[PDB]
A paper describes a structure:
The global conformation of our CSFV [name] structures is consistent with the recently reported CSFV structure with an RMSD value of 0.9 Å (95% coverage) between the reported structure and our representative C-682 structure. Collectively, these biochemical data indicated that the RNA synthesis fidelity of CSFV [name] is fine-tuned by its NTD through the intra-molecular interactions with the RdRP palm.
Although NTD–RdRP disengagement, a situation mimicked by the crystallographic open conformation state in a crystal lattice or the N-91 construct in solution, results in fidelity reduction, engaged NTD–RdRP with perturbation from point mutations can achieve similar level of fidelity reduction.
Author numbering: 13 to 89, 91 to 124, 132 to 273, 281 to 531, 538 to 670
Amino acid sequence: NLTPLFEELLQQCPPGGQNKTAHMVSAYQLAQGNWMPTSCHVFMGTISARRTKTHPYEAYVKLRELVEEHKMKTLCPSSLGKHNDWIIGKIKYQGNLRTKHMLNPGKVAEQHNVYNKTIGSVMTATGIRLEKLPVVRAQTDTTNFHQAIRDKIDKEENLQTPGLHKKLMEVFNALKRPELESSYDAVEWEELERGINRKGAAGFFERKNIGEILDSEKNKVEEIIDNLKKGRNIKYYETAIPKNEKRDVNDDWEKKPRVIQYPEAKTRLAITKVMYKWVKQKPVVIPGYEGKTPLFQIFDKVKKEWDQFQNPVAVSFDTKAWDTQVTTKDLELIKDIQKYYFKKKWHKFIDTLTMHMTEVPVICADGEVYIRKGQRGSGQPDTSAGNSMLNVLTMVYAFCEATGVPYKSFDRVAKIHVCGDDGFLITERALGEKFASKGVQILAEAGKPQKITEGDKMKVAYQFDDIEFCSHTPIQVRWSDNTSSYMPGRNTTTILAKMATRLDTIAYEKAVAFSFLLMYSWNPLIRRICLLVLSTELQVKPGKSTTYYYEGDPISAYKEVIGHNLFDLKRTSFEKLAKLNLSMSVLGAWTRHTSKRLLQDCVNMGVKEGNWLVNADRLVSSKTGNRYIPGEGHTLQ
């Protein structure tokens, strides 16, 4: 009966190893009674117990007792490493973070959401009620910023199963790429400068952004590389800022933590110049890594896998606050894998870098300092590559331990896909259901707790378009050549909000409209707003600040990456569209007039003489009698 109470308690339990010297009992056995727990250290959901005359509820209080006594004896222990001493010398005032689990040695000296006016007014012309759209890209004040630190970052490292990382290395060995062993070398400045945002933010003590350092202090970046190569400490620190702050800028081309934590600009450059081939995944060596896959391609790619199983399911990876769950032992596991691929001349570089990373001085925007114990910093060059690999290994381990499949046999029964901590695997229904039910506890013990579903089971998708990945979900479309394909779907209310606002001109907006058209042409509402915005001021070229932009004609650019003409899209999946439109009605962001007013405005523009983008919309052109004849055009990043 009280099996669920025990299963709840068993994920508070400290992870332990296998105990052959005693009886290991599960939550079922404890609930049955006549089992007396001798230790709260959990191993694969089992506890050491003693046969006795014990009623169930009494056994629960013993375990709960144990779990609390152990928690009392390990909640507030640490020395500062010598290489981090320098930060103490910059402290000027006493600290007020009030951290409980990490040192707040003090404070060093000190050092908006607006509308896209064209996109926004097209929406309003339609009767879309902007003030009813969800809030996106919200900023946070210093007070809630420091609370987020206290809430998420201020913690002890997760305890993990003894010998866990040995086993995760055994998984790695089952998927390494031996032809690449000990081959990675640094890259040239020219190759680095090709894929780099020159606006990459400066760190707390820095003044110049990435571009300015490139142009004028390349020797400072090389002094850092030289120090690390030789095993010598650098002054490593990360800067904390709240999400959507001015320095919340991406180095490379929503899921971010509330607390961005990033290395200096000179330092991000030192790491990338040496560790390029791994942090950029050139080539891809992490199985199922979708970091380079365009969002308009991913679900088509995944469906071909889905179609080869007999009764496929997909099991979602959903780790609570992943970056705060990364342990020193996790980072060293990634260090060891990096050393596998890199030439030996860079091993001491990787050792020293990783060492700096296990205890990181972090400086808040306002100057407060905390010493972070392990964990991942949002802004590190190795976030995507390091988190993806750690996610893959951990999930393959967990699936294999839950199902009994051997690590070397994973590739035979499942497909995995990851984008950092985000991912899922496809496998046969029986395997997937076993993993979903037993994964929660195994991954708790591995130090990667899940956001657990009703019933404490992992989320399982029994039909393809129930998969969740990168905040999107498959939705099918029907083309006029009698084929079907899949596009990245997402709630209309969310798409509208994202398209309608930015953080602090026409050329930008048309870059956005194009970008959104590439992802959301399955959504008639979004598609028609896009075409109206692209119809604005045809003489101004699109900006290049966003995900994509077009050279020449946007409609032809679309056809180049999507594989059909916009005008060939004849149907969007009726059921799924209804799901993704639901919130529009719940929130009252549209009315009964909104689709017809938007279509009418498109028709009014397209009936007139000339060559109008809006006539690339199959239904708009059907009502106007005119088509769009498109020029040349190409999509660019």
